[PDB]
Amino acid sequence: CAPECRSFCPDQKCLKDCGCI
């Protein structure tokens, strides 16, 4: 996922970059 962002869809983009959708 992102370089600086937790999991479980933390933010709007972070969740999209990580792997929520």
The span from the CA of 1 to the CA of 7, in Å, is 8
Residues contacting 8, CB < 8 A, separation 6+: 20
7 CA to centre of own chain = 6
Burial of 4 (0-12, 13-18, 19+ CB in 10 A): exposed
- Residue pair 17/9 in contact by the 8 Å Cβ criterion: no
Read off the tokens for 16.
Answer: 């999209």
- Residue pair 19/6 in contact by the 8 Å Cβ criterion: no
DSSP code of 13? T
The span from the CA of 11 to the CA of 5, in Å, is 8
Read off the tokens for 3.
Answer: 């370089």
Experimental technique of record: NMR
